[PDB]
Amino acid sequence: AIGYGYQVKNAKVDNSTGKSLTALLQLIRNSPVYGPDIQFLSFTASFEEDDTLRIRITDANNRRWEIPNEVLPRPPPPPSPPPQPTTTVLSHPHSDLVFTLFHTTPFGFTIYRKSTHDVLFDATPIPSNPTTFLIYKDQYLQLSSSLPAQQAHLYGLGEHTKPTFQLAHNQILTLWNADIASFNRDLNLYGSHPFYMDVRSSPMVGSTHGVFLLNSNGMDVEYTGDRITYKVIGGIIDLYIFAGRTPEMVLDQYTKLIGRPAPMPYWAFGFHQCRWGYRDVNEIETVVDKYAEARIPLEVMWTDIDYMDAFKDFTLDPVHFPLDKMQQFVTKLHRNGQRYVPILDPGINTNKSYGTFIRGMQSNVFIKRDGNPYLGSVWPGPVYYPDFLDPAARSFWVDEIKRFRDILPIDGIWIDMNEASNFITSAPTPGSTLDNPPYKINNSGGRVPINSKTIPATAMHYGNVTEYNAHNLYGFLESQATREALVRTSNERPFLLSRSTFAGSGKYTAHWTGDNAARWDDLQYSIPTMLNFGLFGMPMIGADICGFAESTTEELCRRWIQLGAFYPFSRDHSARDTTHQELYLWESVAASARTVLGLRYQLLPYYYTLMYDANLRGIPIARPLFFTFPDDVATYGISSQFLIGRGIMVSPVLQPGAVSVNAYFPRGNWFSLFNYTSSVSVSAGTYVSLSAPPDHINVHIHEGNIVAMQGEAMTTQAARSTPFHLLVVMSDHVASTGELFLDNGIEMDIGGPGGKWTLVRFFAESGINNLTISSEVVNRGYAMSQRWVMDKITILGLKRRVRIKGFVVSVISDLRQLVGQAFKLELEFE
Ligand SMILES: C[C@H]1O[C@H](O[C@H]2[C@H](O)[C@@H](O)[C@@H](O[C@H]3[C@H](O)[C@@H](O)[C@@H](O[C@H]4[C@H](O)[C@@H](O)[C@@H](O[C@H]5[C@H](O)[C@@H](O)[C@@H](O[C@H]6[C@H](O)[C@@H](O)[C@@H](O)O[C@@H]6CO)O[C@@H]5CO)O[C@@H]4CO)O[C@@H]3CO)O[C@@H]2CO)[C@H](O)[C@@H](O)[C@@H]1N[C@H]1C=C(CO)[C@@H](O)[C@H](O)[C@H]1O
Ligand SMILES: *[C@@H]1O[C@H](CO)[C@@H](O[C@@H]2O[C@H](CO)[C@@H](O)[C@H](O)[C@H]2NC(C)=O)[C@H](O[C@@H]2O[C@@H](C)[C@@H](O)[C@@H](O)[C@@H]2O)[C@H]1NC(C)=O
Numbered sequence: 001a002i003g004y005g006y007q008v009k010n011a012k013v014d015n016s017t018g019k020s021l022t023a024l025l026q027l028i029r030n031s032p033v034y035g036p037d038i039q040f041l042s043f044t045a046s047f048e049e050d051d052t053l054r055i056r057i058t059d060a061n062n063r064r065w066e067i068p069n070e071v072l073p074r075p076p077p078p079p080s081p082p083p084q085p086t087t088t089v090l091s092h093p094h095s096d097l098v099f100t101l102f103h104t105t106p107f108g109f110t111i112y113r114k115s116t117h118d119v120l121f122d123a124t125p126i127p128s129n130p131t132t133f134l135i136y137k138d139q140y141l142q143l144s145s146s147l148p149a150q151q152a153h154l155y156g157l158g159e160h161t162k163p164t165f166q167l168a169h170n171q172i173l174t175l176w177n178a179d180i181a182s183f184n185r186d187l188n189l190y191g192s193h194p195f196y197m198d199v200r201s202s203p204m205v206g207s208t209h210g211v212f213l214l215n216s217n218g219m220d221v222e223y224t225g226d227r228i229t230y231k232v233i234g235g236i237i238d239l240y241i242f243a244g245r246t247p248e249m250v251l252d253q254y255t256k257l258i259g260r261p262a263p264m265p266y267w268a269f270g271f272h273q274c275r276w277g278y279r280d281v282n283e284i285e286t287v288v289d290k291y292a293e294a295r296i297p298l299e300v301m302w303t304d305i306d307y308m309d310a311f312k313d314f315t316l317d318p319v320h321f322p323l324d325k326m327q328q329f330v331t332k333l334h335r336n337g338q339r340y341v342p343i344l345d346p347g348i349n350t351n352k353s354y355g356t357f358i359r360g361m362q363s364n365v366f367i368k369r370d371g372n373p374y375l376g377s378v379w380p381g382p383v384y385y386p387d388f389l390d391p392a393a394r395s396f397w398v399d400e401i402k403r404f405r406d407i408l409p410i411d412g413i414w415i416d417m418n419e420a421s422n423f424i425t426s427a428p429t430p431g432s433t434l435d436n437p438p439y440k441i442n443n444s445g446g447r448v449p450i451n452s453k454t455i456p457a458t459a460m461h462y463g464n465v466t467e468y469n470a471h472n473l474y475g476f477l478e479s480q481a482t483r484e485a486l487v488r489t490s491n492e493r494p495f496l497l498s499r500s501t502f503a504g505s506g507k508y509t510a511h512w513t514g515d516n517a518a519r520w521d522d523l524q525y526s527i528p529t530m531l532n533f534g535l536f537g538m539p540m541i542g543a544d545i546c547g548f549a550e551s552t553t554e555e556l557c558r559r560w561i562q563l564g565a566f567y568p569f570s571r572d573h574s575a576r577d578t579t580h581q582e583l584y585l586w587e588s589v590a591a592s593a594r595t596v597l598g599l600r601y602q603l604l605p606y607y608y609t610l611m612y613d614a615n616l617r618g619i620p621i622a623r624p625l626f627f628t629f630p631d632d633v634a635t636y637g638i639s640s641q642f643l644i645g646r647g648i649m650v651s652p653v654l655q656p657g658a659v660s661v662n663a664y665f666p667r668g669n670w671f672s673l674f675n676y677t678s679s680v681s682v683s684a685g686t687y688v689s690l691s692a693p694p695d696h697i698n699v700h701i702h703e704g705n706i707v708a709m710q711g712e713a714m715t716t717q718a719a720r721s722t723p724f725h726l727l728v729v730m731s732d733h734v735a736s737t738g739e740l741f742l743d744n745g746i747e748m749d750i751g752g753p754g755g756k757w758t759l760v761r762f763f764a765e766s767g768i769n770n771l772t773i774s775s776e777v778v779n780r781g782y783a784m785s786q787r788w789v790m791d792k793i794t795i796l797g798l799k800r801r802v803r804i805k806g807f808v809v810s811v812i813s814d815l816r817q818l819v820g821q822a823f824k825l826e827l828e829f830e
């Protein structure tokens, strides 16, 4: 058959010293299918922390492709092996995970949790079924685990458009960075994130762990409910298990490994407007002017490939987008506290009168095939691709960006087409098993050759690295170079948005779902994709509001701005062959816009604190319900609702001509952020029909949470100049708590050493006769220097009113309390 598997030749635990396991595996018997088997395997298991188990399987007699440490820094491997069935067990006293190596034929291994004596990863084979074996050929690695089909709820393995957040049973997820529109369901998209979250509904409900395979090669992942299997066409097995035990802790352990999410500037949480096909400077000025007249907040104006001189990077169309007019335009944006972001492609047009091409050829920075720079095909025409694995190409990139930034102020960079995208598929090299692999991954849902519409697998990078191995790293690498370029040309916290991503990208860039469509499906699709990229360590995520491709309708756009105003990254964008869809064009949507974007701007400090938490602990801004309610199994399969932070839930309408929604409400009291009187109270989790007017969206806050809000404004700059309103939602079960992070909105290292930031924590508890509200302040300096003042406190969740020495609403006015000063407020019931 396919493979016969491996036997344990020798296995030992390194005594006394830091406990790790080393083992040598020998091929049982050779098989011709899918290429020759690797004869000897070096197998190690080791704890990187108490809550992280590393399993590394390599060729004992060959250094195989591994993702470079310079690209993704991580602890080095343990030492390798020397030159009833038997078991070798590895465990640590402060670890909840136990690794077991089974000396069967073929061999197996399991990771089980001490806390529940439950198996989390089970690679024990079914002797008669080679689909369950570990197989290790040069271009085919097979790793398989069994799962308790009903108890195991899986999430992740992006990037894919799915109607559901939780992974459906019986499917093949292909991970291979490709220029494929996100309006296509199931197909492999722009990014690859070989990570999944496993939430166990039983025996101990809510029990969570994570599984990451640190491999950049193309792969099919097969999920059949009771089994999951990796089919990888290269590299090694570098497997990481994250103990949990909560969903929160898993993402903490995961991002600790791949990198904490990069902080975002304050202005990034404002609304963005973009469009492919803005004709000239006069049109973008007009769009900004009309957003003002509609009194709809517009923070950042974007320019697509239109601004370039015939689609070449680091140039300006001397006719439609002349330099002096653009300089004026950006100056005026800044004067009104607004920002500007242009787009970049990786391809460099082969124009002999083009400065970027000339310089790129001098530093020898382009990806090569058969000894010559690979000829690509994108917008400007024939292009060469910069090899972002070459440090000289990374210097060249910084140089070009510096040059452009000197003549034209930019507030951020949009990097696109970085799969890399190619419009003309190259012919495969004769006799190459790289351009023609033995196992075909399910690219584009039809076993399409990996070389399709991209750079051939036989192209070479710096250090003799093939495109075959480094393909899923391309967008990741450009994001590093681009962020480097931004940091060295400006002292402010950079902003960048990338299409193609890999595990770890969130440490460098923001992401958007890419090319969605103006269809009701895509509106709903935006939510699982949004929650997935939270797991992937990229909390700054959003979809093109009102849909990129195809023309939108008034009702679709209206319902989309209602939802899209709560994306971490909120932006309107569309193709040029569709109708315009700026929010002012329809009155019903502009009125919706002012409402929803109004609430968002009030929630700016909240969003920013969540961004702070993300960089600090990996915890996503937009998160699944089961993050806050892991003991509620009904929340596991919700794909239509989500949370902003811990206690704010959004429940949008996703179907046309509707005026109501059947949204799920976990146990507790919920209150509308649009009407403090409108509340939802359930003693057990249940669906509830909510009135959803054409201009309204249900956004509720759960009890036990304190949120610091400011005032509405046209810009984020102006919003910070407004007083603070404290929203306190009480609970008869627990003291309410809240958190506010304050900085200048542009410090390079967020919350670092020194004092250009302030952290404030809020606390509230009801007694029989008295209510106490108090804060704690760390690094009081910065907040104090900002004159932030809290003049109002609204109290929800109580059945009795309160005041200074169903449910009711209590308000405390004329407080004038300095945010940067700790306080204890005492109220009395009536
Ligand atoms: C604006 C954006 O423009 C570009 O993207 C465009 C495409 O150029 C455009 O063509 C269009 O592409 C769509 C298709 O219309 C749509 O149909 C879908 O394609 C799917 C198919 O639906 C699906 O069937 C599948 O095809 C497979 C089959 O499944 C498989 O069986 C097999 O079929 C045959 C095979 O081909 C034969 O060789 C033989 O073997 O027989 C078999 C059958 O037996 O293979 C085919 C595939 O070959 O999968 C298809 C996808 O490959 O979806 C695509 C999109 O992927 O629309 C898109 C989206 O607009 C650019 O590529 C894009 O980058 C660009 N967007 C950026 C540009 C700008 C401007 O600067 C920015 O503004 C944007 O934000 C950027 O995102
Ligand atoms: C190399 O870059 C030049 C500068 O952008 C290109 O010339 C410009 O082409 C524009 C249309 O793409 C046109 O509006 C500009 O007037 C023109 N500017 C100048 C100074 O020539 C050039 O394009 C080539 O030459 C022109 C005359 C056309 O025939 C194009 O089709 C050519 O490609 C670029 N050359 C190449 C080979 O890409």
Ligand SMILES: *[C@@H]1O[C@H](CO)[C@@H](O)[C@H](O)[C@H]1NC(C)=O
Binding pocket: 675, 676, 677, 678, 679
């Ligand atoms: C607020 O909500 C309550 C409860 O649904 C409702 O009776 C009241 O009319 C609402 N007020 C406004 C101004 O919509």
Ligand SMILES: *[C@@H]1O[C@H](CO)[C@@H](O)[C@H](O)[C@H]1NC(C)=O
Binding pocket: 769, 770, 828
């Ligand atoms: C509330 O509690 C405080 C402190 O315990 C006490 O001094 C005060 O008299 C109480 N007020 C009422 C109305 O009971």
